[PDB]
Design an enzyme around this catalytic site. Structure first.
Site: not given
Ligand SMILES: *CC(=O)c1ccc(Br)cc1
Ligand SMILES: *CC(=O)c1ccc(Br)cc1
Lengths: 122, 122
Positions: A27, A29, A31-32, A47-48, A51, A64, A89
């Site tokens: 997870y 990055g 998406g996932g 976190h996903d 969003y 923001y 965030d």
């Molecule tokens: C939503 C999330 O966990 C995440 C982690 C690393 C990066 Br770069 C972007 C988003």
């Protein structure tokens, strides 16, 4: 925006922060898919799901409003959609700090071929 | 090793280098397939074909030897296999700087579902 999330990760975690969290487990990055690997990968799953509730603004490109108070990050501003993105965030950077003692290098730049099981519900 | 390719990108391109170049198009990342999107994505396709010609050591995990002279990167050491991996990393860094005028935010964190066409051969 993602440029602001990167500046937030280096203030809380140190100089090598962005390189350590850009790709980890199933997870961490954009998406996932599949099931989480450990406690650090679970912070990115939540976190996903955060969003996914946002409607009317874009989390990758829109800016923001925030400030720094002696080590503590605080969200501000007057637009409701943009303030929602800042809170998703802030909660993830505090989760990375609380779980540093169990981080494992065998999961850094893992791969998608090992994330093929039935996906976990939010 | 991949940790060394990241630190070399931040020296040549500046502070936001790792966040801009480790996730872009169909080939700048792990597991590439399909057709290259633009000029910056083609610099990453050529780098993948360069790694495939290395036959007695591992590009992802083995460490090499390097330094700096008159502001430019120089490759060193006493093992021929490790020096070959260093040269593939140095040439890619010069291709990113030569093509900076055409970088596009539409291809930053591009999804894998957009790359399912047949792959171009080396
Ligand atoms: C939503 C999330 O966990 C995440 C982690 C690393 C990066 Br770069 C972007 C988003
Ligand atoms: C060979 C190349 O360009 C590349 C880029 C990103 C990652 Br992660 C691995 C390899």
């Amino acid at each position: 925006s993602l440029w602001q999330f990167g500046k937030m990760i280096n203030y809380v975690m140190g100089e090598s922060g962005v390189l350590q969290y850009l790709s980890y487990g199933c997870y961490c990055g954009l998406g996932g898919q599949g099931q989480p690997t450990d406690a650090t990968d679970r912070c990115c799953f939540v976190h996903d799901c955060c969003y996914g509730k946002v409607t009317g603004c874009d989390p990758k490109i829109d800016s923001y409003t925030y400030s720094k108070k002696n080590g503590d990050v605080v969200c501000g501003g007057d637009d409701p959609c943009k303030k929602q993105i800042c809170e998703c965030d802030r909660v993830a950077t505090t989760c990375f700090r609380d779980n540093k003692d169990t981080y494992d290098i065998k999961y850094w730049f893992y791969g998608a071929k090992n994330c093929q099981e039935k996906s976990e519900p939010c």
